[PDB]
Design a protein around this ligand. Structure first.
Ligand code: A1AR4
Ligand code: A1AR4
Lengths: 306, 306
């Protein structure tokens, strides 16, 4: 029993982290086979960053301008190229610690683990969700760019995020590992802003099931609601619509607890209209929306990874 | 910016996790040099566990009764012994992945990372605090015993916890790596209960400083209080006393924010007496007490580990 915000074990990713230095800029790179991936704004300097032309900037660079450190071992860069907002540095050594991996792009509402890194050295690991507005509520300081987000499926690491920047509200934006940003953000200095967010309804329901599985039942009731009537309430409280596919995804958790999905919707409705009355759910006084149904099943059942 | 419950990168510990099977019981072991450490209740069976005599049970065992799996490689047990509530299985192979390590015992109020494991395979990593009542609010299922808790200091892993059991309120108890329980718990079936807990005051103050550093200031005020007058309020709300040493430990965070410790105590006082009025701090609607001052400085400043 118990329910924690849980990340994947980070060892497979730690072995891929390197330090990339170009000019005055040092950030992190991801070393897989004989390529190091990193944010392309590494080729920028403090007056380049206002409105740079990266193609112009890159043709001016040399392989030897890129300093790559794998711990205390220097990797010779033998080629470079740009792919969207990432740089691909070809090195003369394949990473002997390369795990089985995939480059995947995730959906808003899905979760992943972040290995925060500085100077190519892992600092910490934590769990994030991709918000509906394509930002993530991370924890990142100067020098964290190139840190990556990932999921692990048995022995395969699915990389889904590389960190690029902080927005003015303190949330974070970045790209998939093909260099394509999540959301309408650019790797430049403009007045970029997040844009309105919503609460991930299916995740809140999954967490309520996590609570029931763990013995928190005070919010349960005998009432039910229809999907349409629930979604009218969701609209009003800035929750995203619940679809029939969400209902279907919640089926297993429904069956394990014996609480019909629409019955849990009725409970959520009352929580939204009444609040919590000084009470808590799984140690929170807010409705938590950064656990997916998968996250709940994995934790409340015990899936491992080799 | 941002503030997350952050664990240490788990790779150094993943390389030490093995599977230990004796009879019908399978749990996790920690493999360091040529010793595998695991909970001694592995030698128990489903009628042994009511009130066992472990010395009697252990002299009845043979080296070959202990099945140790390091991934898909079997480790030959060449000796065994009991140390308090842990078993030490000597194996004929030293773990080539042994990190630099220490066995440390932590204080209530301190934090650590947990690498939850099943069948010798890491499942997830999360951050825990040792509660004032010596329990931890973990996330553990059947088969998780022998999972360990740890901190990392540059390149050295300080192991501080091995998981042994779940208490009836769903919280968890275990031992240090010398096999000595945290708190008044035993590895038997009795009617053990946690016992009353309190809130870790110095940690709540550290988190309030984390909030200020991150731009949450609505709870700040022009009032101050004395240490004695604050502690009268702490008493009433089941918070542990704040000492002068706590004040001193908060000095750096005080200096970075320009908010005197006793001024932040005055803010905490009003939060305790008034509540939060529908407002949040660092994404929480409760006063959070599982971040130490060290945790705050590490995250809001960017310390790494090699
Ligand atoms: C990469 O290490 C850094 C990560 C940031 C720093 C603070 N917290 C983070 O997550 N990225 C970074 O600084 C990027 C790089 C660019 C340069 C071209 C794009 C700028 N930038 C950024 O985050 O912009 C924030 C900003 C807004 C307004 C003025 C100055 C900076
Ligand atoms: C180890 O895998 C397991 C971890 C528990 C299981 C559920 N969540 C956890 O953290 N430990 C475990 O089962 C220990 C082992 C003993 C056997 C002698 C000590 C029993 N035990 C335990 O947790 O007791 C809980 C319990 C209380 C009342 C009746 C039955 C079990």
């Amino acid at each position: 029993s118990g329910f924690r915000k849980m990340a994947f074990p980070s060892g497979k990713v730690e072995g891929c982290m390197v330090q990339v230095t170009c000019g005055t800029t040092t950030l992190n790179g991801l070393w897989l086979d004989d390529v190091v991936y990193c944010p392309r704004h590494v080729i920028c300097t403090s007056e380049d960053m206002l409105n740079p032309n990266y193609e112009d900037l890159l043709i001016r660079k040399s392989n030897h301008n890129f300093l790559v450190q794998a711990g205390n071992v220097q990797l010779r860069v033998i080629g470079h190229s740009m792919q969207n907002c990432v740089l691909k540095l070809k090195v003369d050594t394949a990473n002997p610690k390369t795990p089985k991996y995939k480059f995947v792009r995730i959906q808003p509402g899905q979760t992943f683990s972040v290995l925060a890194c500085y100077n190519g050295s892992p600092s910490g690991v934590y769990q994030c969700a991709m918000r509906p507005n394509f930002t993530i509520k991370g924890s990142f300081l100067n020098g964290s760019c190139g840190s990556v987000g990932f999921n692990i499926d048995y022995d395969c690491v699915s990389f889904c995020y590389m960190h690029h920047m902080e927005l003015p509200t303190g949330v974070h934006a970045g790209t998939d590992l093909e260099g394509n940003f999540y959301g309408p953000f650019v790797d430049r200095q403009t007045a970029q802003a997040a844009g309105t967010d919503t609460t991930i309804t299916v995740n809140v329901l999954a967490w309520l099931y996590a609570a029931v599985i763990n013995g928190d039942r005070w919010f349960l009731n005998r009432f039910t609601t229809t999907l349409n009537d629930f979604n009218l309430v969701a609209m009003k409280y800035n929750y995203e619509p619940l679809t029939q596919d969400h209902v279907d995804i919640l089926g297993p958790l429904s069956a394990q607890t014996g609480i019909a999905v629409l019955d849990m919707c009725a409970s959520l409705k009352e929580l939204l209209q009444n609040g919590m009355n000084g009470r808590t759910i799984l140690g929170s006084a807010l409705l938590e929306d950064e656990f997916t149904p998968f996250d709940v099943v994995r934790q409340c059942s015990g899936v491992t990874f080799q």
